[PDB]
Amino acid sequence: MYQHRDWQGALLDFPVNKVVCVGSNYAEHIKEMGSTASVEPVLFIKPETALCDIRQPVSIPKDFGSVHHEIELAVLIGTPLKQASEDRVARAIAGYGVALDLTLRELQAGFKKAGQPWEKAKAFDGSCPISGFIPVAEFGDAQQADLSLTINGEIRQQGNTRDMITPIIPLISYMSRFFTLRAGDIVLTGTPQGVGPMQSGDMLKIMLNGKTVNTRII
Amino acid sequence: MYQHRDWQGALLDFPVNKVVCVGSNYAEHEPVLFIKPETALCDIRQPVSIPKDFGSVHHEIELAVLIGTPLKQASEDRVARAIAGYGVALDLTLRELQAGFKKAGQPWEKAKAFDGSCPISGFIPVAEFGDAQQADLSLTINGEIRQQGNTRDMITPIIPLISYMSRFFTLRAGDIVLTGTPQGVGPMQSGDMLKIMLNGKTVNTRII
Ligand SMILES: [Cl-]
């Protein structure tokens, strides 16, 4: 089972339960998916079995079609939130990290056309490789963070959270109307443009502001 | 806080994690799969809370299955040995919200995964439950029978269903599987008095 860690690799003591995620949160990503924005945030969830340490080799399933990377800012909740105001949300954030919301894109496309749930495409084992968390105190302005994903030496995604359609705080406030977010829950804030396929053997370099993690698909 | 129990209410030693569920698994109502998180779970014997601004909330009575040993890409034989017990649950669904998501091709989590959306009973051990593919399920609201069905009518039976699920999601010991709902799904409201039956074992509760 996955365990939360700080950037240095130290174990953190928060419980692990779920990851609440937003789709269609960057306009350029909405455009490359051929979709449109939604009136309210598009929400889905990944279970504990999706979570894994991004610093270790990242396993992807081989039989379900192509697996696409979606780099995203991850937010660690340190205090439980239910129907929480924006101010309560702000005070509840423990740290920030970077994840890949790995997606079986072909399946997802079929689910969308059939009006079917996304879990098989978004929730599968290991579909959420994630970094250690950076303290709120050292992270700076969360809504201005840079994210970059380089695969085999080529930049694939490079973006900044300033481009979020629904900003972090109101987003988390919104999510808490539906789901109690326990201490130790993680929130994924969406992916910018550049989403694409990965295959076994690819080398990944991932950066969150000035900080780097490296790994390999395998 | 929700913890797993046996039918009578004693604590079972299994952690609580997630609930893996199937849609459209009975005719009158590749398996459609979705998941509810731990925050969906609550004790069915206690008054049941439903949300007020999300539209109609509908009951779906279903046979619930407690996983007692971990399953990943497991054979039907391994699955059978894995089951620790059986219970009954309501898969509460915000139907109008869901009708919206289906049309737009959005995920179902808001409609299926919301807090308290899995009221569930205690579990009866496998040895004492008899044939789980023959189980009677019954839901009466305010004296009127709303759902009445039997698991023999499952489109995909329990064992193959759980085997299929494990191809996608690892099922930890303590995970619960929901098997689908028979026909008669309908809205519930505050004040509703509920009588639930699993093979004649009766539990009563109420909404609000
Ligand atoms: Cl009894």
UniProtKB/TrEMBL annotation, chain B:
<dbReference type="GO" id="GO:0016853">
    <property type="term" value="F:isomerase activity"/>
</dbReference>
<protein>
    <submittedName>
        <fullName>Isomerase</fullName>
    </submittedName>
</protein>
<dbReference type="Pfam" id="PF01557">
    <property type="entry name" value="FAA_hydrolase"/>
</dbReference>
<keyword id="KW-0413">Isomerase</keyword>
<dbReference type="GO" id="GO:0046872">
    <property type="term" value="F:metal ion binding"/>
</dbReference>
<dbReference type="InterPro" id="IPR011234">
    <property type="entry name" value="Fumarylacetoacetase-like_C"/>
</dbReference>
<feature type="domain" description="Fumarylacetoacetase-like C-terminal">
    <location>
        <begin position="18"/>
        <end position="200"/>
    </location>
</feature>
<keyword id="KW-0479">Metal-binding</keyword>
<dbReference type="InterPro" id="IPR036663">
    <property type="entry name" value="Fumarylacetoacetase_C_sf"/>
</dbReference>
